[PDB]
Amino acid sequence: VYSDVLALSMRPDGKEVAVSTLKGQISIFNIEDAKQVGNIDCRKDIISGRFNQDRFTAKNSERSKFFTTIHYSFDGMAIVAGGNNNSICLYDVPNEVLLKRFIVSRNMALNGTLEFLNSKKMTEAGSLDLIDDAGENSDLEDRIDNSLPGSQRGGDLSTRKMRPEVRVTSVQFSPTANAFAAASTEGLLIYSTNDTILFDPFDLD
């Protein structure tokens, strides 16, 4: 394949393999042959956050424009992908076009949400979020910064000295009822269609 692949998944047919490379693009291979059926392009329709401590625009950072998971539906006709970005996708497999894009969360508290930070936070020396408000707090137990220096995704949430990142780690479809669960930073999401407040007719006269 072209770049580093990560997070494979196989169709329940047993005849196709869906890949998520680092260039963003998701490719669909055959197994009995080595050739590929097609690939679907995922670098554009991924929403990426600018973090608070960043120095680049959210448009041209290469943090989150790939997909660190993929899971075929049990129909074998749709892929749900999710990575360290803010967004989840639903690609159609034959027609090769995404269906709907889901923003996982809208929190200023988490880092990877905003495409564009506010400008009034930027004081001449630095963002007004990176300033430690920890010493202002009334209790002792809040003020004690025990964060290790470069601990990323570490043991406790205190040991970051950063806001938690937005990432959707692993995504699977449900077996039963058109649901799929994406495991987020905020916690495991569940999307569904159990409403059916929708007029989806078939063969009306």
Binding site: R55, E124, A125, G126
Partner: protein
């Protein structure tokens, strides 16, 4: 437009002049005497 790799300005010790230990910062060949021979020393005469 703030610069990258900024760091808190702090005191150089190997370079600063205000420190006590760092406050500090023509050949000469004496002619062998016009009296002297190789070792004889031809000038000394009594009285000594």
């Amino acid at each position: 437009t703030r610069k990258f790799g900024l760091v808190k300005r702090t005191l150089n010790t190997k370079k600063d002049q205000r420190l006590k230990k760092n406050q500090e910062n023509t050949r000469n060949i004496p002619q062998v005497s016009s009296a002297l021979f190789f070792q004889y020393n031809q000038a000394i005469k009594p009285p000594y």
